[PDB]
Amino acid sequence: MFENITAAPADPILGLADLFRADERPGKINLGIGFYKDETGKTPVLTSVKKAEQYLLENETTKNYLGIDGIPEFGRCTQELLFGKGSALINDKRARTAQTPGGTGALRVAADFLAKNTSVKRVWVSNPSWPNHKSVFNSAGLEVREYAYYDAENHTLDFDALINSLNEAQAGDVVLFHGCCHNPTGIDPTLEQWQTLAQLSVEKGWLPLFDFAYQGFARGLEEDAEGLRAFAAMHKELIVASSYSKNFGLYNERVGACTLVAADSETVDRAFSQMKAAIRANYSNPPAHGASVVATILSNDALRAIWEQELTDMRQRIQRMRQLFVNTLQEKGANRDFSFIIKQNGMFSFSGLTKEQVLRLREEFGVYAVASGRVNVAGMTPDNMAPLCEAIVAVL
Amino acid sequence: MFENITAAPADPILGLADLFRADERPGKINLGIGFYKDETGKTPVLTSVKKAEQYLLENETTKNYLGIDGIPEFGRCTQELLFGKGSALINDKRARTAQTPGGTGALRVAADFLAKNTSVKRVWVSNPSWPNHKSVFNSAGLEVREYAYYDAENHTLDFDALINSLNEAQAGDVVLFHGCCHNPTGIDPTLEQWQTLAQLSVEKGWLPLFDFAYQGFARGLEEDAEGLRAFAAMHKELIVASSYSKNFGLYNERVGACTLVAADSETVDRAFSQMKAAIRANYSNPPAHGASVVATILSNDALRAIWEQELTDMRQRIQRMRQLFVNTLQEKGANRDFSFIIKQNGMFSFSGLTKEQVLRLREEFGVYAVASGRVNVAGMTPDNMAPLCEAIVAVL
Numbered sequence: 001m002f003e004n005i006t007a008a009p010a011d012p013i014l015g016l017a018d019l020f021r022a023d024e025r026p027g028k029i030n031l032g033i034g035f036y037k038d039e040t041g042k043t044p045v046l047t048s049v050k051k052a053e054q055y056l057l058e059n060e061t062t063k064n065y066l067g068i069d070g071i072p073e074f075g076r077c078t079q080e081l082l083f084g085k086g087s088a089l090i091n092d093k094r095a096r097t098a099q100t101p102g103g104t105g106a107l108r109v110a111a112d113f114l115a116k117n118t119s120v121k122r123v124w125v126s127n128p129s130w131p132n133h134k135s136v137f138n139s140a141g142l143e144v145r146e147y148a149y150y151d152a153e154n155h156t157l158d159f160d161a162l163i164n165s166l167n168e169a170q171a172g173d174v175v176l177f178h179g180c181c182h183n184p185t186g187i188d189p190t191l192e193q194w195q196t197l198a199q200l201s202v203e204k205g206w207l208p209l210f211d212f213a214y215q216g217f218a219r220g221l222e223e224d225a226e227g228l229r230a231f232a233a234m235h236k237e238l239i240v241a242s243s244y245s246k247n248f249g250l251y252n253e254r255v256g257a258c259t260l261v262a263a264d265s266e267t268v269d270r271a272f273s274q275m276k277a278a279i280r281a282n283y284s285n286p287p288a289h290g291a292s293v294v295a296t297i298l299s300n301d302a303l304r305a306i307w308e309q310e311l312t313d314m315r316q317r318i319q320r321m322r323q324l325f326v327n328t329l330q331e332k333g334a335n336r337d338f339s340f341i342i343k344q345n346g347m348f349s350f351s352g353l354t355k356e357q358v359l360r361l362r363e364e365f366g367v368y369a370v371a372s373g374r375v376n377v378a379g380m381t382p383d384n385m386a387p388l389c390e391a392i393v394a395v396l
Numbered sequence: 397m398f399e400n401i402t403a404a405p406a407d408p409i410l411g412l413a414d415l416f417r418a419d420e421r422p423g424k425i426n427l428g429i430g431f432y433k434d435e436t437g438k439t440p441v442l443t444s445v446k447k448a449e450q451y452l453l454e455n456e457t458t459k460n461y462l463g464i465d466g467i468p469e470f471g472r473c474t475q476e477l478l479f480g481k482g483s484a485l486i487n488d489k490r491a492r493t494a495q496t497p498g499g500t501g502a503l504r505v506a507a508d509f510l511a512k513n514t515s516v517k518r519v520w521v522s523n524p525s526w527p528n529h530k531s532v533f534n535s536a537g538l539e540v541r542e543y544a545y546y547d548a549e550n551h552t553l554d555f556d557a558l559i560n561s562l563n564e565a566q567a568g569d570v571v572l573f574h575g576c577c578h579n580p581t582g583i584d585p586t587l588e589q590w591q592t593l594a595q596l597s598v599e600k601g602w603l604p605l606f607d608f609a610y611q612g613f614a615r616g617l618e619e620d621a622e623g624l625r626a627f628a629a630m631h632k633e634l635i636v637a638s639s640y641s642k643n644f645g646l647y648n649e650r651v652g653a654c655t656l657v658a659a660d661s662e663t664v665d666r667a668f669s670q671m672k673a674a675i676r677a678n679y680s681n682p683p684a685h686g687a688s689v690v691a692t693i694l695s696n697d698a699l700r701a702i703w704e705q706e707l708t709d710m711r712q713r714i715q716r717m718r719q720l721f722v723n724t725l726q727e728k729g730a731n732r733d734f735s736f737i738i739k740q741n742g743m744f745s746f747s748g749l750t751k752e753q754v755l756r757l758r759e760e761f762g763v764y765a766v767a768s769g770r771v772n773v774a775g776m777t778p779d780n781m782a783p784l785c786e787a788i789v790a791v792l
């Protein structure tokens with residue numbers, strides 16, 4: 001059976017890690033990292049999280065199955081985080097949330113749900129986007145098309161080309177948007193560009209699908225949801241796949257949610273029954289630990305205050321490195337102006353490097369970045385900033 | 397988009413729970429339960445598990461992503477549990493294990509893997525089998541056919557009909573076997589019937605797929621794997637989907653494994669790369685907590701001794717109830733002989749009740765069983781045995 005099986009190609013993101021661990025050179029610098037690192041290059045478990053795990057250890061009395069859509073408390077906390085408390089969507093009972101195995105798990109359940117109970121056939125993803133979007137949607141037999149987004153010259157959001165592309169998107173098509181901290185560019189629309197996209201969206205009949213994995217990393221918790229909120233006010237239907245892997249540092253516990261929004265409770269309930277059927281046939285019910293940690297933190301004022309503080313600390317550190325990066329580059333002799341870096345949000349930035357330059361940075365200087373040019377700013381520290389900038393410059 | 401969506405039908409197993417919680421009658425008895433309950437009707441977290449969680453709380457330094465196939469330690473412990481240490485499969489490096497979100501998650505990844513990189517088109521499931529098998533395989537676009545298995549008269553394994561049916565199974569088809577404690581009948585083949593199936597299997601070119609969710613519940617850890625071991629000795633390729641939900645009481649943490657076995661390491665490695673690609677596109681990487689608990693327990697002699705003891709205790713309790721059930725039935729006036737119950741393994745038993753009798757037990761006596769007649773013996777206690785047997789008899 002398996003003799004004919006062809007080896008699968010290297011994952012563009014994860015495969016880099018393998019090359020890195022094998023590069024026995026000492027001065028190594030891994031910037032193609034998808035997670036957060038702190039000042040010492042460590043990725044610790046949050047204190048709020050450790051506190052929540054202690055509470056769970058001495059309070060859990062059973063590990064009995066969770067129920068297809070998971071912990072209810074978790075579901076409402078995510079809804080409030082996403083839509084706010086003064087949300088008509090929540091008061092009209094128009095949204096339903098299913099706890100899933102991470103943000104990827106949410107995208108897949110959305111994908112299977114749509115492919116099986118809907119006439120959706122195409123999903124529009126940005127160019128570029130997170131490499132795994134394509135594989136997730138294609139896994140469900142949906143075709144992935146892409147709209148323009150990035151301006152390789154001015155290093156900005158080419159809004160005209162964006163809208164120009166989306167015109168080929170027909171009614172009934174799913175259009176995917178990153179809530180904030182666009183992976184891999186770091187370029188997000190403005191509240192004004194979002195409101196324009198929201199209107200264009202309802203007028204054209206697109207089904208929006210927000211991938212939300214970095215809430216709290218751009219400006220703040222509520223500020224980061226303004227784009228989603230703009231859409232939620234004008235659309236009857238909507239789908240948001242959220243992750244708590246990065247903002248809670250709960251990566252390996254697989255915590256995420258797939259939120260379904262329909263015209264009324266009667267409809268979203270009917271549609272949600274088919275979403276639960278898709279989970280039942282996939283992983284059955286979700287992992288309790290991570291989601292449990294998120295629900296207890298978010299529901300306890302003391303713990304939530306510590307978490308939010310830990311989150312702003314992470315956010316502030318990334319902003320500090322974006323600034324120090326641009327500066328160090330300049331004093332190291334950079335010819336090109338990298339000020340646009342300071343304009344980008346979150347952990348990632350398209351360094352504006354060519355396939356050949358990143359390849360050269362890797363084999364000659366030991367600096368690792370994703371082939372696309374994506375660089376993770378949280379992989380920089382005041383200790384490795386200089387070596388990094390010298391290599392980058394020597395390759396310019 | 398969602399206005400046309402039809403409500404999904406009630407899950408045959410999970411939907412019963414909903415009816416139960418709504419039946420405000422006091423004397424309720426839920427036997428259609430899929431999990432273990434102890435003497436007091438509770439389903440506690442194991443002591444070995446609590447001990448392992450404490451150890452993890454004070455030793456984990458990061459929640460960083462796990463890597464597609466999960467914790468290595470976990471992978472080898474499951475392989476030893478499944479094949480034994482004096483296993484050629486392990487020494488020849490012919491098996492590869494991927495940690496998955498439970499046993500259902502393992503079945504789905506196997507299913508997507510086979511449907512996409514293989515010419516498999518049909519899976520043969522027993523009649524009857526666990527209701528979710530069909531949905532999992534159909535979710536991957538594979539067709540599910542069923543072989544005879546149960547003898548509704550003698551309440552045994554109709555081996556002749558079994559083999560008779562499997563003859564329509566062609567080479568390249570996947571044949572699914574329950575490792576032990578057949579869900580829902582409790583009827584398992586004997587070592588002799590297993591060896592016959594193993595030979596018939598290699599001669600016909602079937603791809604075996606063992607669903608292993610109750611290792612340690614029939615006779616014991618090693619004894620329960622004899623059927624799988626018989627097959628592993630004569631087959632070049634094989635797939636086993638295991639779960640630790642029931643034998644570790646880790647239900648909601650989603651702990652399971654999908655083990656791939658091929659002719660040699662070179663082949664299983666090539667084939668495994670495509671299995672990891674299927675996970676990446678589904679949930680990305682697995683939940684660490686549950687698997688972490690299983691790996692630390694299984695690797696520590698002290699903790700593993702306590703676990704095994706807790707497991708034998710569970711096993712012994714089920715065997716006690718099977719005996720008390722048959723006895724109480726007899727002294728309550730049972731006309732039919734239920735001795736066959738004592739012959740069955742694990743938590744489940746096909747009570748040999750009609751659709752109308754279970755329906756009557758439910759609405760008139762408040763006794764809940766799955767429509768198939770499946771009853772969970774671990775749902776009985778010395779306290780509710782009498783009321784239960786009186787209802788069952790009054791319905792005979």
Ligand SMILES: *Cc1c(COP(=O)(O)O)cnc(C)c1O
Binds near residue numbers: 103104183243246256
């Ligand atoms: C990290 C990420 C995901 C995946 O979330 P997990 O929680 O890691 O599965 C999905 N989308 C984007 C854009 C991401 O960056």
Ligand SMILES: *Cc1c(COP(=O)(O)O)cnc(C)c1O
Binds near residue numbers: 500579639640652
């Ligand atoms: C319980 C069960 C499963 C599912 O395992 P989880 O670990 O609960 O996903 C699969 N197969 C059978 C036969 C089972 O009884």
